[PDB]
Motif scaffolding. Sequence first.
Motif, PDB file in Angstrom:
ATOM      1  N   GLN A  36      37.642  22.518 -17.077  1.00  0.00           N
ATOM      2  CA  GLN A  36      38.441  21.782 -16.111  1.00  0.00           C
ATOM      3  C   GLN A  36      38.376  22.348 -14.701  1.00  0.00           C
ATOM      4  O   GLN A  36      39.071  21.831 -13.823  1.00  0.00           O
ATOM      5  CB  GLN A  36      39.906  21.723 -16.562  1.00  0.00           C
ATOM      6  N   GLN A  37      37.577  23.383 -14.447  1.00  0.00           N
ATOM      7  CA  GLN A  37      37.403  23.910 -13.094  1.00  0.00           C
ATOM      8  C   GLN A  37      36.071  23.421 -12.551  1.00  0.00           C
ATOM      9  O   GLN A  37      35.014  23.693 -13.148  1.00  0.00           O
ATOM     10  CB  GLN A  37      37.462  25.437 -13.064  1.00  0.00           C
ATOM     11  N   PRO A  38      36.065  22.707 -11.425  1.00  0.00           N
ATOM     12  CA  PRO A  38      34.794  22.155 -10.926  1.00  0.00           C
ATOM     13  C   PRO A  38      33.821  23.208 -10.427  1.00  0.00           C
ATOM     14  O   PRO A  38      32.674  23.247 -10.886  1.00  0.00           O
ATOM     15  CB  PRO A  38      35.246  21.220  -9.797  1.00  0.00           C
ATOM     16  N   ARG A  80      37.099  20.679   9.572  1.00  0.00           N
ATOM     17  CA  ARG A  80      38.100  20.026  10.414  1.00  0.00           C
ATOM     18  C   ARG A  80      39.137  19.239   9.622  1.00  0.00           C
ATOM     19  O   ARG A  80      40.230  18.991  10.142  1.00  0.00           O
ATOM     20  CB  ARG A  80      37.407  19.121  11.435  1.00  0.00           C
ATOM     21  N   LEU A  81      38.829  18.845   8.385  1.00  0.00           N
ATOM     22  CA  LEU A  81      39.803  18.180   7.526  1.00  0.00           C
ATOM     23  C   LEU A  81      40.750  19.161   6.847  1.00  0.00           C
ATOM     24  O   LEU A  81      41.701  18.728   6.184  1.00  0.00           O
ATOM     25  CB  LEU A  81      39.075  17.333   6.474  1.00  0.00           C
ATOM     26  N   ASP A  82      40.521  20.465   7.020  1.00  0.00           N
ATOM     27  CA  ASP A  82      41.280  21.513   6.336  1.00  0.00           C
ATOM     28  C   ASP A  82      40.990  21.497   4.839  1.00  0.00           C
ATOM     29  O   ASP A  82      41.833  21.863   4.023  1.00  0.00           O
ATOM     30  CB  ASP A  82      42.781  21.390   6.609  1.00  0.00           C
ATOM     31  N   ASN A 105      37.879   8.278   6.182  1.00  0.00           N
ATOM     32  CA  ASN A 105      37.690   9.134   7.343  1.00  0.00           C
ATOM     33  C   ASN A 105      36.721  10.267   7.040  1.00  0.00           C
ATOM     34  O   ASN A 105      35.947  10.679   7.912  1.00  0.00           O
ATOM     35  CB  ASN A 105      39.050   9.674   7.781  1.00  0.00           C
ATOM     36  N   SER A 146      29.585   9.397 -28.319  1.00  0.00           N
ATOM     37  CA  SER A 146      29.593   8.490 -27.179  1.00  0.00           C
ATOM     38  C   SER A 146      28.208   8.404 -26.545  1.00  0.00           C
ATOM     39  O   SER A 146      27.379   9.304 -26.696  1.00  0.00           O
ATOM     40  CB  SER A 146      30.612   8.948 -26.134  1.00  0.00           C
ATOM     41  N   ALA A 203      33.413  10.848   9.341  1.00  0.00           N
ATOM     42  CA  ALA A 203      32.973  12.116   9.904  1.00  0.00           C
ATOM     43  C   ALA A 203      31.578  12.458   9.416  1.00  0.00           C
ATOM     44  O   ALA A 203      30.735  12.922  10.193  1.00  0.00           O
ATOM     45  CB  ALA A 203      33.958  13.225   9.539  1.00  0.00           C
ATOM     46  N   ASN A 226      44.807  41.819   2.251  1.00  0.00           N
ATOM     47  CA  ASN A 226      45.703  42.960   2.127  1.00  0.00           C
ATOM     48  C   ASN A 226      45.545  43.912   3.300  1.00  0.00           C
ATOM     49  O   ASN A 226      45.860  45.086   3.179  1.00  0.00           O
ATOM     50  CB  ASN A 226      45.463  43.703   0.813  1.00  0.00           C
ATOM     51  N   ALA A 248      37.916  33.576 -15.903  1.00  0.00           N
ATOM     52  CA  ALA A 248      38.621  32.606 -15.069  1.00  0.00           C
ATOM     53  C   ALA A 248      38.724  32.951 -13.587  1.00  0.00           C
ATOM     54  O   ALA A 248      39.071  32.079 -12.785  1.00  0.00           O
ATOM     55  CB  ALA A 248      40.030  32.377 -15.621  1.00  0.00           C
ATOM     56  N   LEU A 258      32.835  13.076 -10.851  1.00  0.00           N
ATOM     57  CA  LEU A 258      34.130  13.106 -10.176  1.00  0.00           C
ATOM     58  C   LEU A 258      34.037  12.196  -8.959  1.00  0.00           C
ATOM     59  O   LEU A 258      33.091  12.295  -8.172  1.00  0.00           O
ATOM     60  CB  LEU A 258      34.527  14.524  -9.776  1.00  0.00           C
TER      61      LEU A 258
END
Lengths: 482, 118, 401, 687, 294
Positions: free
Chosen positions: A409-411, A166-168, A131, A113, A135, A229, A359, A434
């Motif tokens: 697949q983990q950013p 603030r967006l959590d 939003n 490709s 912000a 814990n 991982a 992404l």
Amino acid sequence: RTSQESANVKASVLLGSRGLDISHISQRLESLSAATTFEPLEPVKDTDIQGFLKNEKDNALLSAIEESRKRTFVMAEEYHRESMLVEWEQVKQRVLHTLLASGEDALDFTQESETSYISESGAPGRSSLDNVEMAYARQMYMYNEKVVSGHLQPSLVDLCTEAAERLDDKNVSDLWVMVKQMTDVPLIPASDTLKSRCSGQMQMAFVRQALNYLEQSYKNYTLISVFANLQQAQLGGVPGTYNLVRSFLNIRLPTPIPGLQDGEIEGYPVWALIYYCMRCGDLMAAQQVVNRAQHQLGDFKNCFQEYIHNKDRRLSPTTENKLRLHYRRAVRASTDPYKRAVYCIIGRCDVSDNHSEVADKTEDYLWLKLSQVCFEDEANSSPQDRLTLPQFQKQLFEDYGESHFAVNQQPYLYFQVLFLTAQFEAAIAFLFRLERTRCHAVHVALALFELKLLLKSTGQSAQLLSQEPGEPQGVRRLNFIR
Amino acid sequence: SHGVPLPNWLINRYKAMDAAELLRLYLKYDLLEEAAELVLEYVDALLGKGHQYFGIQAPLSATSQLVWFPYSAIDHLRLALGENENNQHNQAILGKLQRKMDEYFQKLKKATDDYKKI
Amino acid sequence: CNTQITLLKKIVKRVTPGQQKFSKTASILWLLQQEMVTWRLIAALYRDRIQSALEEENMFEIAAPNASEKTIVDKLFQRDTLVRQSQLVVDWLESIAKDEVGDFSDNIEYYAKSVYWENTLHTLKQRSMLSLGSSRPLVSELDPDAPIRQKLPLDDLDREDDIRLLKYLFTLIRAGMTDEAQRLCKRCGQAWRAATLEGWKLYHDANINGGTELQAVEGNPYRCVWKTCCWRMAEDEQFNKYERAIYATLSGNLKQLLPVCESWEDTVWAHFKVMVDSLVEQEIRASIISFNEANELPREYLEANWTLDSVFEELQATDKKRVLEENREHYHIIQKFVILADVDGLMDEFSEWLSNGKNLLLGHLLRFMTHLLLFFRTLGLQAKEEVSVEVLKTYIQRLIN
Amino acid sequence: TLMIDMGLFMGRSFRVGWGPNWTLVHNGDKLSERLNAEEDRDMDTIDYGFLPKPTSAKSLTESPFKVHVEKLSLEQKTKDLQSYLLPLEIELKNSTVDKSGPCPHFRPNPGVTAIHDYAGWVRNFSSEAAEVEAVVKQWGLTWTLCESLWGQLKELEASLDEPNEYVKNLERRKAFSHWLAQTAQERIEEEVSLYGPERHIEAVFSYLTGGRISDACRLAQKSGDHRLSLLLSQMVGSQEVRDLITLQLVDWNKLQVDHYIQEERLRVFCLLSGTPVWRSSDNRSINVCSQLDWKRTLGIHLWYMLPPTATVAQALHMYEQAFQEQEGGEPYACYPLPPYLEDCGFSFGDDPSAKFISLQRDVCVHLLKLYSERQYDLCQLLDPSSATPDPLDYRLSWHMWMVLQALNYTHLSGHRQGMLHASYAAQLENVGLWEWAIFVLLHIQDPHVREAAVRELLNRHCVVHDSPESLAKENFLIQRLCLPAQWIHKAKAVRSRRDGDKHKEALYLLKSHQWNQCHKLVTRHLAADAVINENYRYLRGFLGELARPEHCKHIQDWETAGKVYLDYISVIEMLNQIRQDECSGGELEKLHTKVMSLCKWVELIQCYSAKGRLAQSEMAKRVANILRVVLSLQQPPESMSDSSSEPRVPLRLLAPHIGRLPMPEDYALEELRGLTQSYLRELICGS
Amino acid sequence: SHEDMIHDAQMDYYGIRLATCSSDRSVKIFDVKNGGQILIADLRGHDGPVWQVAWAHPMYGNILASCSYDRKVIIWKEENGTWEKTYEYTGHDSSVNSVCWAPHDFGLVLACGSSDGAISILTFTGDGPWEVKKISNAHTIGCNAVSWAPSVIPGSLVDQPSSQKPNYIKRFVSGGCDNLVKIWREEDGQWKEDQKLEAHSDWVRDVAWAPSIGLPTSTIASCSQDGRVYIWTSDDAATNCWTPKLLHKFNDVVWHVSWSITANILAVSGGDNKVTLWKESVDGQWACISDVNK
């Protein structure tokens, strides 16, 4: 072969049903696992000798047929090998005849490709932004106010960090935590990352910041685990490096696996304590541990304390040569991964120790790698630790791919790897891929530009990513203006 | 309903069939010590050798960390003892039985420890 | 267009995950395969039509048994048209199937296990072998009917690798991929099952010549009654899906063939299979002189009439919504008009297409209907001209775009 | 009881569950043990209504067992209907009915009158019924605040409005003033009973907080308070007034007179001077805040801190910095709280830790933040429970964010938006007003999630029954709800398949046209039922509509049975009527042709049930009877067809097919005997 | 009524019949009407103590399944007012502990886990076979609690119209007694490893899928013996975004979690003879909105 354990557990049950403490039964089951059944001086067991002997005969006949069929398997596997030799001879001649007769035994090929470019669009009033972006707009607007006023303002990293929480969006807030942490460990600008990488002092200082960064990051995750814990760790937020260490051992490693070298202090694995001391970076706690374990180590305790005091993080070259001579010939492998790694790093030799850290602990993998990585790429009498670091990095990234540690697949993981390895350009191009991450990469790259970094590609109609000779090959030059 | 005891053959058959139901038959009209030997036999079969009289299989096992227990009925016992306390002998029996109970439990924890060695 | 098929395959596979922007490309590629199979269908159908038109004046025959039954067979194959085009459309569908198959041979290189009921093996071994056996019931027999005959259980890993090979060969024979069928049999050691495969293939020999030499030794001539036996086994039921389907197939048993075929292609396929069978056995009994009891079948099965109309009447009347929704699909309508030569229906349907416009009829659809009309004309077949010119003007509108 | 015992086992004991109508089923004790007195056991309805029918009843010797089931109730119930209904009656017009989907989908249709009708009716009801709730007042509060920030009032619709930014700011401020005028009415009415010329400076403070100079002056004059009245005009005089006060009070500071003057008039003076906090020579902090509302705070800020004609946003900005930390220093203004929270205390500034403790934030202040900057997180706008005790009636706030979308703002996370959509429709399904829960749901864009949800509602709400109230219910469902009866027939059909009402399952299966399954079930049951009970009308219409060829197309084996029995019944009725009048051969010939034919297909009748074959037998005996009757009467007693001829019987064609079925020897005897003399002549005249 | 206290008891879809199961060895059933109720039945059969049943979806009709200590699952279908024993399975070594029906969108398949260390999943054609999907070594020790995939939940389906039917991939969740939780997806005809979760260093007791209607995200309330209640949430499993949050630190062995039929709130059985009623408040946090003293 589910045997042995199922026998010994209920054997210990019956023996305890007749008395005597577990030490003798442990020795007896050890000897049961030793050689075959029934003593040359004869058992010598406890009550229910009849059931003892019935099952003993059953297992003995099991063992006899196991020995027989295992020898037969030895011969049969040799015949397997020779048979497959002949079989591949046949398959190879098959392939030759197919190719000579225009036949085939199966084949495959395609094409790769090339770059495809896509974007988004805006909208006024009822707009195309979010939003999130609104912000962000507040933050960069107030920021640019001080920028144009010539006043000094806090890092855009933080600005958009408190913009974030603030967006959590706690994961992104954490991403800013890493970014801001790596900014806080300071990074001397050189007006393009090429100058920084070409400057040999800057790469050494960057290594220093990277090691401080990973130490503090592991300490932070240790803190997160301990507070998560907190009931198990038995603190009310109570500080203290020593009780933190003891509580963290109570959680992660109260009991070690069978097969360790050196005993445990009050139930803590000594080498585990030492390793966690390095990983959190608490030199005072490391000194406390080594002072408590001086007896198990002898003069090696003094050697390690001298190494600790040596911020070179290595002893004298003559001592290093003598100890590596000792290790290469005699000490080498053992049943203590920590001892083996310690000897390997002190001699700055051998890259065998990898263990299992996929991982969620590939960061500890990385710490392992960097700690063994030496300050020179020139092959000394230990060439396994004297390597072209950029080539090493690139083969870790692309050639080692992204699926082995499952970062395909983990950013955050692979990205942060690229960043800490200073591949800001391709890392940002990565974030670009992404959809939701473009604004974020924008803020990050703007911070880099503030720090006087980033690569440039010549041209105005040229594409985003380019490669240009003069800069070491493989580092794509991102067209910043593109 | 007419105040009548039970025959031995019925006792034995229906013992091999179903126990705790007969236990609260005792609960219906005060067959306390009767329930007591039931409990004795329960723990004894737990130790093994006697499950058959309950139509059960338990010569003593070494594969299950935990199994079913009628401890609901056991606390029902202690409750009924509290109800009709005049039998210091019976409550001493209860105490000795609880001693057998925690002997059971120390064996239980030893077995659990041995499994967790696996 | 197959090369271009491959081109779109390459595009769609080179698409990274998480991008349905080329889901449209894949869907168009799908429609491309549909138009391809339409090409196959029409081309073969009307080459058979041409051969029939060439050979119109000598249809159908008569004779009496005088030699080996393969004489009966090849007579039957030559004499009738309807079964002939049925055979050709079946060849179509199963050519599709085998093209889908390809190298499943080399791919099963990595599906293999050759230990018979290995779990039951090892566990009965340990029962015989240890201090402690098992409280678990198992067969003492390896028989393919050992469990159900004995009602005894078998192990899950055993039965499920079984089901896996059942997918393999089930598919292989829904395609009829018989060489690979005996391949898999002699992989997994079901030579019994491979034997079971042979109960229907007829018998012959022609060694009336030369030395004692093999002309044919194939099978047991007990096959008419043997299919009758399978017929009644089906009436007995209690089968796995795979055996149920395969032998309800070998019988053409409609109700027990219902479970497995749900596709449009599968249901039309089954229509053809059932009607071809019923026909072929009818002229078997007709050609081989007999009118007495030698086999038993239900009266309605014996007396059901067969025609190409019934194909699509069944297909339409399918109360299964999968087939129902497939029926309204354009390619299906197109190809079934190809079979039916329903020119008025086709022109009206084209009329609603153009009423909807040209957005539903892309440039390549218009070109395809154009080739449609082209080969109509080269056959001296003429469609409705205003509809033709409407389609062509819209197509040229595309072309000039 | 006992709970001391511990171990690795146990647990594997009690749990709980939920049931429909938002009830919960539980061995756990009820919630009404704190709502009423002299309670019962196994109470399984809210309040009272659990009937004394068999339940979990046991004696008290080892502790018995029970289960309560309760539907949680909240607040008080007098006429709670209208408070919900009217916002929804207006949202009717505020909504749209798009017909996409197997029932219509509703898309928003708000504008500027959306909150103009909501809020105005809120007042309208609030006046027509004096029984509104303080929470109703809270929601009217939110109505007015949103209207002010975006909605358009009538005082500037009867007056041309002007686009200059300054005009917009002052108009937004004058509307704010009229708002406060509406708000402080009841506050004035409450403290007016409290105060007097004894409390006259407190009245001064209140009047200053109101900016209600008019009636303040009227009071001062009715009391003859001339000096104070003159002071009143000076409250919003020129800036020179405040220069006067600054220098004058600096003088009083140098004069120490405060020690001799009550801080009461002094706080009046601070109010006039725009000084919120005073620092005396003793560094005495004389603050102005007392009894106020945060509303009153920012109103004072407007009128007095900056030019009273200034904008909204910068005054808000100063107020927020005032009750927030300034430079790490103490807040000095009022920290906004929701109404039920200032019911539990309030702040005037200072000590940010006591703000950190809990101290949520007023939703009204969040609205100003979104009205000031367009880059606001809007997240402070949510949970209308801020000015209300509980978030039970999201009506107002919901209508507000729809108006916001009309205004091209609130670009918020749709997941949260639809989540709250579900919350409010949940309130609706709580109150049990179903049509309403539906359409309120219907304004969201996740299509078969919506369809599944509405199926949930349908299942919960539609139970097959006969009542005029229900009839009116579908009336509403169709007239404006316009909801395809496909779904209602689906629901009442599965309801009927539960309960066993044959008429209703048949009717609604026909109505929804589940062709295949309705086919199969009628064949299973209904055919035999109707043939044996002779109720041909209903399944006559049934098979007639089923016979339509498209129905034949979507059902397998319609041709096998259904139209076949339709043929039976049709022949039966027409032959009956042809004798009900004088017969004509032009239909008798058709009788012969179709009868002798369908004789050929009676054979293919397949019965997979004992009752099916029993109805088959009943059919066979009846067809034999009627065939005898017609073969006798086809030679009419006055219009004989053949003279005396004994024709050759078509049994040569009938027998090979009739011999394919068994026959009960009850009437098979007479049939078989007739067949005997038939075969006698047939064989005496055989081949 | 029942001789032993009730573990589980479930009303119908219509509120008009109640099934009530104890370990009292039998399960009793009332019709429900007007507030009144008649015990219509008491089904026997279960040669192990009974914990759980499982009702099926209404478009199928009226279906119940049940587990017992005897390793027997009994399967009950209602006719003419009579529920009766329709299919029954055994073959299990340890008591069958968890049974739960799948969404009717996926069909009439029950999930059947036991502390065997392995789990079967059983399909009923409704008239025909009981298709078996048995997964061994599902646990290294045993299975405690299991939850399905609820069939339809927001996140990508806004653009998917109501007229069509989407692909129904099968997935689910569970937690066992090997100190681990795990997540499964179905493909190739079988199930493979979405996720491994090791955060409760002790055995997990019960698991709660937030019915994520309105939620693009994936939300879990996991309760273990160790007193830690984890809200596990991932917006995306493919980007691997599962994170733990504390819901409450109860100091008892934390027992049971069950979402409302109204799919709004969660009931949590605590070691207090109480069932805490928690609701994720409108804002951002989990608030115990009420309680029921068991």
